[PDB]
A paper describes a structure:
Starting from only a choice of chain length L and oligomer valency N (2 for a dimer, 3 for a trimer, etc.), the method carries out a Monte Carlo search in sequence space starting from a random sequence. The loss function guiding the search is computed by inputting N copies of the sequence into the AlphaFold2 (AF2) network, and combining structure prediction confidence metrics (pLDDT; per-residue structural accuracy, and pTM; an estimate of the TM-score) with a measure of cyclic symmetry (the standard deviation of the distances between the center of mass of adjacent protomers within the predicted structure). To eliminate such over-fitting, we generated new sequences for the HAL backbones using the recently developed ProteinMPNN sequence design neural network (accompanying manuscript: Dauparas et al.).
All crystal structures had the correct oligomerization state and closely matched the design models (median Cα RMSD of 0.6 Å across all designs, with resolutions ranging from 1.8 to 3.4 Å). The side chain conformations in the crystal structures also closely match those of the design models. HALC4_136 is composed of 3-helix protomers with eight outer helices encasing four almost fully hydrophobic inner helices, where two of the helices are rigidly linked through a 90° helical kink.
Residue numbers in the entry:
A (entry chain B), B (entry chain A), C (entry chain A), D (entry chain B): 4 to 68
Write the structure that this text describes.
Amino acid sequence: MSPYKKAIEITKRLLELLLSNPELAKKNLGGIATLISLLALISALDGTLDEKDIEPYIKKLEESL
Amino acid sequence: MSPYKKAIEITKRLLELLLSNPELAKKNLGGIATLISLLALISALDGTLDEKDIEPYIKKLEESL
Amino acid sequence: MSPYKKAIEITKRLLELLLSNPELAKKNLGGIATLISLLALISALDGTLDEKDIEPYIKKLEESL
Amino acid sequence: MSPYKKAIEITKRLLELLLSNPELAKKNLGGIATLISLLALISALDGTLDEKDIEPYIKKLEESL
């Protein structure tokens, strides 16, 4: 478990928490977006960035607009 | 191709989402700001930071106050 | 001494500020989450990420919903 | 102007914008805190983290609670 891999898992857990309730998601759009950016940054630091792993979250965010 | 370049494109996509609607942008100013900071950080990690690539977003933020 | 260690201490201070008041924490869930992600990122940059150092904050976040 | 130094200046500009109006600051506490964390992280990446440069912002945030 590389440190970056642990940080990815944590950030994905945080995204699921904030998106779990759409009413809570719509009041925290900026934070969800910032988490998605952080997930990409950490992934690129780990050298395992795959766009397919990020797009589901972007599409969920878009639906919550 | 670079993983940082993919993360830059994702972060700009997220900024466009949050700025698309002036009313949603005024409700998420801190999130837009944190995304502009991240865009700058990721750009510096990628070696390529041109201020001219950030400033448009900063002026858009200033517009929403 | 390490600059990353100072940034870890600052980020934990900010998390304690935002969590001190349950009412302010429920209004800033996305910010608490993004700080927990950053704490993990910075820890991974410093080489030292122990999940046990992050989990208390995650459970506190889950408490505020 | 090293890329990290440009990112520091941008992040400090963003902090001043969000803190410029206390009424706007109190609605964006989480984003201000996340910006302060990012300022520390970027500073440590540049190898120029001085706690004295960060504390003024933390004290302003505390006053806005």
